[PDB]
Write a structure and sequence with these properties.
- Chain B: Keywords: Disulfide bond.
- 2 copies of one chain form a homodimer.
- The first copy, chain A, is mainly alpha-helical and 76 residues long.
- Chain A has a single domain, classed as Helix Hairpins.
- The interface between A and B is medium-sized, with 23 and 24 residues.
Chain lengths: 76, 75
């Protein structure tokens, strides 16, 4: 039940967004490797991303000066 | 007592940060010191996040049954 620190939330959000773009790039490759498995992972990454985003929207009211959420998830 | 992140979110985060940390460690052995300072600053941050994640996941291991050991996540 503890909260995560806002700094932790930024690191996690940026990390999962990058991993998500990495797997999307693989899947759009001409002859894809392990597609079923990448799609299963991506379900999980999206759920984690959505949960992080909710926690960050709380942080924005509590810790000053944080970037807008759309900046953290920018490509790049 | 309020973000209420799900255990599974913490698992994905833990794994993601451990992987990004190994990536930056690898890059530091490529023999290009150009941005070594910058990668080392980032690595401090990644380690801080990893510690905070680890704390939170240990709470989860106390509230819920059948979650994987922490060490399995960071292998």
């Amino acid at each position: 039940m503890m909260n995560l620190k806002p700094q932790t939330l930024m690191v996690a959000i940026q990390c999962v967004a990058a991993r998500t773009r990495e797997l999307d790039a693989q899947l759009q490759n001409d002859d894809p490797q392990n597609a079923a498995e990448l799609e299963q992972l991506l379900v999980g990454y999206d759920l984690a991303a959505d949960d992080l985003k909710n926690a960050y929207e709380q942080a924005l009211g509590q810790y000053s000066g944080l970037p807008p959420y759309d900046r953290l998830i920018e490509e790049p």
